[PDB]
Design a protein around this ligand. Structure first.
Ligand SMILES: *[C@@H]1O[C@H](CO)[C@@H](O)[C@H](O)[C@H]1NC(C)=O
Ligand SMILES: *[C@@H]1O[C@H](CO)[C@@H](O)[C@H](O)[C@H]1NC(C)=O
Lengths: 97, 49, 48, 48, 48, 49
């Protein structure tokens, strides 16, 4: 999506997460900014030695190479053939006999 | 879902719910704009069926 | 090796659609266009 | 395989993404017959 | 709550009992399923 | 390496090889002596394992 999302300074509004107590479960969301404790030390406040902000951004710029460039993603997830259907593809029904 | 002006950030990945509607997945599958379209429990051709 | 009957099929396409040449596919080249037989024995050679 | 129901494989996958599943069902099912027919032969000796 | 779907099942039966939970058997029907996606750690009721 | 008396000029940067030994980072990533440590294809936490 480089021509849609990229900017020659870096579109810094996109954040990923670098740290986590544990690998999150399938389809889990985690809204947090609480500082990651890389040292054995406890670490309060906004920053600290070996105390890392748990997010970092992408700098998205058109001047980068392929692979660096921003990708949009959609994951279409669905469940099938086991419950009352609420979505269908464009097949018309026939009569019933 | 595919032309919306800003997407969300991954750490706060948006979820939209879909129901009570008709789904022409040939729209998604045919467009060259998409680099990858990998399906993990259906063939992409079968989505319309 | 040796080969019974050998046929070279030649054409030009957009590179995005090279993947449609794979033996069982369904983009417009593979559809209305040049369709491989599913048990296709042979090679595909492509270049920019 | 993705299911026990053969039609829920066939009505979801194409002719070749299905094979990788259907061959599993053919394999396991056929071993289920070979096991039954072995037990029935060994049993047929007890009754004989 | 399963994978973001909160589900309610319920039953109402008549009874005639003075104090404890009535010994016997019956099953709850599924009443509703809602896509709520929230975390639920804990809960409370609502009197009137 | 980190504690060397003298370091090289970057125009002639030293390229030293390391082997036959154990890579213990505990007196390293966990240590006050550096105002930056960034890894680029591993988690620094994993450098022991
Ligand atoms: C939801 O968060 C609460 C409070 O932190 C926690 O006790 C519970 O384990 C969490 N459950 C899930 C699945 O996130
Ligand atoms: C360097 O070595 C000294 C001991 O010779 C040690 O006290 C110090 O922590 C070391 N520093 C680093 C950055 O490894």
């Amino acid at each position: 999506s480089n021509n849609l999302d990229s900017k020659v300074g870096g579109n810094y509004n996109y954040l990923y997460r670098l740290f986590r107590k544990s690998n999150l479960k399938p389809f889990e969301r985690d809204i947090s900014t609480e500082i990651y404790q890389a040292g054995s030390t406890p670490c309060n406040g906004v920053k600290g030695f070996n105390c890392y902000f748990p997010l970092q951004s992408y700098g998205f710029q058109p001047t980068y190479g392929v692979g660096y460039q921003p990708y949009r993603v959609v994951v279409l997830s669905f469940e099938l053939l086991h419950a009352p259907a609420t979505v269908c593809g464009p097949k018309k029904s026939t009569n019933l006999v | 879902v595919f032309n919306a002006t800003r997407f969300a950030s991954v750490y706060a990945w948006n979820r939209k719910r879909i129901s009570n509607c008709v789904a022409d997945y040939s729209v998604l599958y045919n467009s060259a704009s998409f680099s990858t379209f990998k399906c993990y429990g259906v063939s992409p051709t079968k989505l319309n069926d | 090796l040796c080969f019974t009957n050998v046929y070279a099929d030649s054409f030009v396409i957009r590179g995005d659609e090279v993947r449609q040449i794979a033996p069982g596919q369904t983009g417009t080249i593979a559809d209305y266009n040049y369709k491989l037989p599913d048990d296709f024995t042979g090679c595909v050679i492509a270049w920019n | 395989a993705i299911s026990s129901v053969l039609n829920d494989i066939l009505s979801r996958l194409d002719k070749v993404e299905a094979e990788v599943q259907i061959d599993r069902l053919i394999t396991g099912r056929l071993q289920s017959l070979q096991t039954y027919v072995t037990q029935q032969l060994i049993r047929a000796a007890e009754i004989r | 709550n399963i994978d973001g779907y909160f589900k309610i099942y319920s039953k109402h039966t008549p009874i005639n009992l003075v104090r404890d939970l009535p010994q016997g058997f019956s099953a709850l029907e599924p009443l509703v399923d809602l896509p709520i996606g929230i975390n639920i750690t804990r809960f409370q009721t609502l009197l009137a």
